[PDB]
Amino acid sequence: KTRWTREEDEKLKKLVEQNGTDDWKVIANYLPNRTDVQCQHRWQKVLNPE
Ligand code: NA
């Protein structure tokens, strides 16, 4: 239940740009306390502000 920080969002965006989205476990590996699913969901949100 940890809120997302701007630094996390930026890291998330760059991690996806460099690695792609075929493996969310790779992306999550670099975001402490964030799982693959949490990273995919956040990414979808940052792409289109709900
Ligand atoms: Na993680």
CA of 20 to the centre of ligand 1 (A): 16
Alpha helices in 1-50 (DSSP H): 6-19, 24-28, 36-47
The span from the CA of 35 to the CA of 50, in Å, is 21
CA of 14 to the centre of ligand 1 (A): 15
The span from the CA of 42 to the CA of 49, in Å, is 10
Q: Which amino acid is at 50?
A: E
CA of 37 to the centre of ligand 1 (A): 10
CA of 33 to the centre of ligand 1 (A): 5
Q: Is 36 helix (H, G, I), strand (E, B) or coil?
A: helix
Burial degree of 24 (CB within 10 A; 0-12, 13-18, 19+): buried
Phi, psi torsion values for 31, nearest 5 degrees? -130, 90
**Domains present along the chain, CATH in parentheses:** 1-50 (1.10.10.60)
Nearest of 41, 46, 49 to residue 7 by alpha carbon: 46
Technique of determination: X-ray
CA of 47 to the centre of ligand 1 (A): 20
